[PDB]
């Protein structure tokens, strides 16, 4: 989508309420992630927890292996609900974009305003 003045007004009006909501979501999502991470470290397979290395056969560059570096926690429902997982995913997307913007701000100081 292309930029527009109406959307600019919308986002400028809701800038600070949006930041406050993002902070609250950050606290909630940190709690959810902490539960998931503790469960992964405790009950995860040895390869998944130890982060086993899988290298390419041509240039020997490491990358995540779907079999070894990904693990489906079948018993996660006891600790974390479906809605919490959805909340964490949505927050991860929002946090990634916010993190890039914050990095730009820190890198360029006050020249990032325009």
């Amino acid at each position: 989508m292309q930029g527009s003045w109406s959307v600019l007004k919308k986002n400028c009006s809701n800038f600070f309420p949006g930041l406050l909501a993002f902070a609250q979501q950050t606290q909630e999502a940190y709690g959810i992630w902490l539960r998931i991470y503790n469960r992964q470290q405790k009950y995860g397979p040895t390869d998944f927890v130890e982060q086993s290395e899988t290298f390419s056969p041509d240039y020997h560059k490491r990358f995540h292996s779907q079999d070894k570096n990904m693990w489906v926690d079948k018993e996660l429902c006891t600790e974390v609900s479906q809605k919490e997982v959805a909340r964490l995913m949505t927050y991860k997307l929002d946090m990634w974009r916010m993190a890039h913007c914050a990095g730009a701000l820190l890198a360029t100081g006050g020249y990032a305003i325009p």
């Binding site: 130890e50 982060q51 086993s52 290395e53």
Partner: peptide, 8 residues
């Protein structure tokens, strides 16, 4: 560094 990386 990862545990497997250190072991290697």
């Amino acid at each position: 560094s990862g545990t497997a990386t250190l072991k290697r």
